[PDB]
Amino acid sequence: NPYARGPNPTAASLEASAGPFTVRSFTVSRPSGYGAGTVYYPTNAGGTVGAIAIVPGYTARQSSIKWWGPRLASHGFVVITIDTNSTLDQPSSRSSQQMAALGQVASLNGTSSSPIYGKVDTARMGVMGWAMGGGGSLISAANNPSLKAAAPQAPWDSSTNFSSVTVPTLIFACENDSIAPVNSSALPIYDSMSRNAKQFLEINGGSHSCANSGNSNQALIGKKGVAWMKRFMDNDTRYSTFACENPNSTRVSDFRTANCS
Numbered sequence: 343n344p345y346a347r348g349p350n351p352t353a354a355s356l357e358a359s360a361g362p363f364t365v366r367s368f369t370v371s372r373p374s375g376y377g378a379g380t381v382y383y384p385t386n387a388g389g390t391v392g393a394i395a396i397v398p399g400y401t402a403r404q405s406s407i408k409w410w411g412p413r414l415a416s417h418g419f420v421v422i423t424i425d426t427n428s429t430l431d432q433p434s435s436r437s438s439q440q441m442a443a444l445g446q447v448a449s450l451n452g453t454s455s456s457p458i459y460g461k462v463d464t465a466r467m468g469v470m471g472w473a474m475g476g477g478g479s480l481i482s483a484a485n486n487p488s489l490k491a492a493a494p495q496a497p498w499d500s501s502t503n504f505s506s507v508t509v510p511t512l513i514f515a516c517e518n519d520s521i522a523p524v525n526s527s528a529l530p531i532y533d534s535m536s537r538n539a540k541q542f543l544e545i546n547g548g549s550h551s552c553a554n555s556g557n558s559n560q561a562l563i564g565k566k567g568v569a570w571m572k573r574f575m576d577n578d579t580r581y582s583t584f585a586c587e588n589p590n591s592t593r594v595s596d597f598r599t600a601n602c603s
């Protein structure tokens with residue numbers, strides 16, 4: 343596997359706050375089609391790595407999703423967290439901006455002054471996001487089936503029919519979400535997907551912000567997010583158990599998965 347990076351994973355190493363690689367970051371000088379961006383990247387991966395673009399929810403900014411940046415980059419990914427052109431943008435707009443940020447990461451991979459010059463395999467990308475940004479991530483996956491993974495959190499869209507999604511998709515959900523209730527959003531969305539590897543992970547007692555920066559389940563959520571991206575963006579079957587398993591954890595009130603190998 344030309345995409346495998348880093349040491350063989352363990353539960354402990356995936357539950358830790360940081361993976362094996364050293365992380366640095368920079369601010370995007372001139373955002374190409376979105377509001378603002380921070381790029382997180384590993385300084386010492388042994389090869390090119392995939393890129394992941396992450397979008398907040400309605401009214402929210404990079405701080406709500408920031409924690410994914412170092413958590414994912416330290417395991418071997420270039421991660422861009424964005425602010426949208428407006429905090430009031432809707433999911434379809436969020437998806438356009440998410441993909442524009444991926445495009446600019448790819449541009450910077452070819453830009454000799456960039457710290458990520460030659461660090462990105464631009465053919466291997468993923469999408470994540472909170473709430474309307476999670477709906478935007480699903481729209482992004484629907485419109486761009488060459489994306490290798492999606493892992494939205496507490497998603498919402500005006501439609502729950504994402505039968506168009508063929509991208510391996512992990513849905514983080516929050517049991518007590520009153521903004522995007524699981525029964526009208528995350529779960530109908532999950533059930534709609536028929537052609538992909540997919541997973542549903544609902545955090546026991548979680549509010550709408552249960553997968554945001556500062557959540558109290560970073561060990562489990564971080565392990566699952568990293569394992570999903572490693573398994574499907576890197577084709578890295580060393581992560582197949584971590585990606586596909588029921589964690590059989592008390593922090594999970596609802597677990598579902600299908601077509602996972």
Ligand SMILES: O=C(O)c1ccc(C(=O)OCCO)cc1
Binds near residue numbers: 401474498
């Ligand atoms: O009313 C809704 O259905 C609805 C309301 C808000 C959101 C959202 O993205 O903002 C959540 C906080 O960032 C999504 C769905």
